[PDB]
Amino acid sequence: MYVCHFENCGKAFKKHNQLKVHQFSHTQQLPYECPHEGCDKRFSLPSRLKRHEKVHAGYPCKKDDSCSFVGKTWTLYLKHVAECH
Amino acid sequence: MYVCHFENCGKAFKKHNQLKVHQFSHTQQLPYECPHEGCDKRFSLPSRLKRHEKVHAGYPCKKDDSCSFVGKTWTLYLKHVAECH
Ligand SMILES: [Zn+2]
Ligand SMILES: [Zn+2]
Ligand SMILES: [Zn+2]
Ligand SMILES: [Zn+2]
Ligand SMILES: [Zn+2]
Ligand SMILES: [Zn+2]
């Protein structure tokens, strides 16, 4: 089965095209797609997309796979790495 | 900055605890949490959680990291692997 990854859904469909058509119900409401290849993040406002693209530009913590820290600068990244985990 | 991973959000906070408090606004609306360790999936209905747990029990496609197929049976998994990608 093809399973919908959108939040609070998980509806499953026998055929891939049925999932794609279903998913239009989500993407219509979230027209602003992240331009990075492989990233499935979408938003309903341009400002939220822009904020998200700035996060891509930063320095994500990979010490912990649970950690949601993304440093705006290299200084703040190395400080985080030293003080956490 | 600590960045919120919930859909259509991405709000960022200087401190980890500020993100956690913010995230209560999401989790209050999605009370049904997946019991699998490492899985952040949440739902607003018990039926959606149950469906999601059944997906965990199945056979996820790992030929493609984009593919959303999860086989209900081993037969259907190997058929998918042969006919796709
Ligand atoms: Zn869906
Ligand atoms: Zn992105
Ligand atoms: Zn971290
Ligand atoms: Zn949020
Ligand atoms: Zn799960
Ligand atoms: Zn596949």
XYZ file of C-alpha atoms and ligand atoms in Angstrom:
176
model
C 0.000 0.000 0.000
C 1.091 3.594 -0.676
C 0.876 5.582 2.567
C 0.267 9.324 2.908
C 3.060 11.049 4.874
C 1.153 14.283 5.570
C 0.455 15.131 9.200
C -2.554 13.543 10.927
C -3.306 11.358 7.920
C -1.583 8.090 6.958
C -4.390 7.073 4.590
C -3.243 4.169 2.417
C -4.011 3.386 -1.241
C -3.529 0.286 -3.419
C -2.137 2.274 -6.372
C 0.497 5.011 -6.442
C -1.647 7.321 -8.581
C -4.530 7.097 -6.083
C -2.193 8.374 -3.366
C -1.007 11.203 -5.633
C -4.579 12.320 -6.319
C -5.419 12.093 -2.611
C -2.374 14.211 -1.773
C -3.668 17.119 -3.864
C -6.121 17.676 -0.976
C -3.084 18.482 1.221
C -0.922 20.396 -1.285
C -3.798 22.710 -2.318
C -3.756 23.981 1.274
C 0.068 24.152 1.389
C 1.027 25.832 -1.925
C 4.553 26.899 -0.850
C 6.977 24.033 -1.439
C 10.574 23.899 -0.279
C 12.834 24.131 -3.372
C 15.550 21.832 -1.957
C 15.722 18.415 -3.636
C 14.537 15.640 -1.328
C 12.750 17.997 1.078
C 8.996 17.423 1.385
C 8.306 20.459 3.608
C 5.390 22.671 2.525
C 3.651 25.754 3.946
C 0.495 27.859 3.525
C 2.355 31.214 3.699
C 5.396 32.605 1.850
C 6.873 33.843 5.160
C 6.916 30.301 6.594
C 8.644 28.970 3.466
C 11.268 31.723 3.673
C 11.972 30.988 7.347
C 12.330 27.314 6.466
C 14.804 28.057 3.641
C 16.897 30.103 6.099
C 16.990 27.043 8.373
C 18.430 25.046 5.435
C 21.218 27.642 5.212
C 22.162 27.133 8.877
C 24.083 24.464 10.772
C 21.907 21.510 11.854
C 22.910 19.497 14.929
C 23.764 15.889 14.042
C 25.159 14.829 17.445
C 21.618 13.735 18.296
C 19.106 12.664 15.611
C 16.342 13.860 17.965
C 17.855 17.350 18.388
C 16.027 20.143 16.560
C 18.819 22.730 16.918
C 19.956 24.548 13.787
C 22.642 27.185 14.354
C 22.380 30.537 12.568
C 26.181 30.902 12.784
C 29.227 28.682 13.083
C 29.998 30.229 16.490
C 26.553 29.299 17.812
C 26.770 25.821 16.286
C 30.087 24.968 17.977
C 28.774 26.419 21.256
C 25.747 24.124 21.035
C 27.909 21.089 20.240
C 30.085 21.822 23.294
C 27.304 22.586 25.798
C 24.750 19.908 24.785
C 24.703 16.098 24.373
C 17.811 27.987 17.242
C 15.431 25.121 18.068
C 13.070 24.586 15.126
C 9.534 23.185 15.269
C 9.127 20.112 13.025
C 5.309 20.110 12.997
C 3.604 20.618 9.647
C 3.139 24.167 8.326
C 5.141 25.647 11.188
C 8.943 25.796 11.504
C 8.813 28.471 14.216
C 12.229 28.799 15.855
C 13.150 29.496 19.495
C 16.400 30.489 21.238
C 15.930 27.981 24.082
C 14.943 24.313 23.961
C 12.286 24.713 26.660
C 10.594 27.521 24.697
C 10.206 25.143 21.752
C 8.801 22.438 24.045
C 6.184 24.815 25.453
C 5.305 26.012 21.946
C 4.890 22.409 20.801
C 2.144 21.782 23.364
C -0.064 23.856 21.020
C 0.390 21.079 18.415
C 0.291 18.001 20.680
C -2.930 19.129 22.426
C -4.616 18.786 19.025
C -2.864 15.467 18.259
C -3.227 13.450 21.503
C -2.551 10.012 19.938
C 1.195 9.395 19.806
C 2.908 6.531 18.026
C 4.386 4.189 20.682
C 7.447 3.227 18.593
C 10.724 4.698 19.869
C 12.077 7.378 17.542
C 8.762 7.901 15.732
C 7.313 11.412 16.032
C 4.004 10.633 14.276
C 0.859 11.842 16.067
C -2.874 11.849 15.285
C -6.166 13.383 16.459
C -8.107 10.074 16.294
C -7.438 6.589 17.710
C -8.327 5.018 14.331
C -5.555 6.972 12.569
C -3.014 5.892 15.198
C -4.066 2.253 14.808
C -3.736 2.403 11.013
C -0.288 3.929 11.449
C 0.818 1.166 13.857
C -0.298 -1.432 11.285
C 1.943 0.311 8.737
C 4.872 -0.159 11.165
C 4.108 -3.897 11.152
C 4.370 -4.070 7.346
C 7.263 -4.117 4.889
C 8.485 -0.626 3.918
C 10.155 -0.121 0.531
C 13.796 0.950 0.893
C 14.797 0.658 -2.789
C 13.800 4.313 -3.111
C 13.919 6.734 -0.146
C 11.107 8.686 -1.848
C 8.834 5.625 -2.183
C 5.872 5.536 0.205
C 5.016 1.856 -0.380
C 4.594 -0.366 2.668
C 3.606 -3.961 1.902
C 0.948 -5.664 4.030
C 2.506 -9.055 3.188
C 5.861 -10.448 2.141
C 4.340 -11.571 -1.179
C 3.169 -8.036 -1.961
C 6.492 -6.556 -0.849
C 8.582 -8.754 -3.171
C 6.119 -8.074 -6.009
C 6.585 -4.334 -5.489
C 10.380 -4.662 -5.389
C 10.314 -6.586 -8.691
C 7.833 -4.380 -10.580
C 9.001 -0.919 -9.405
C 12.278 1.068 -9.370
Zn -3.247 12.316 3.351
Zn 13.262 22.121 2.961
Zn 21.926 19.301 19.314
Zn 5.160 24.644 15.747
Zn 5.194 5.501 14.206
Zn 9.059 1.249 -3.611
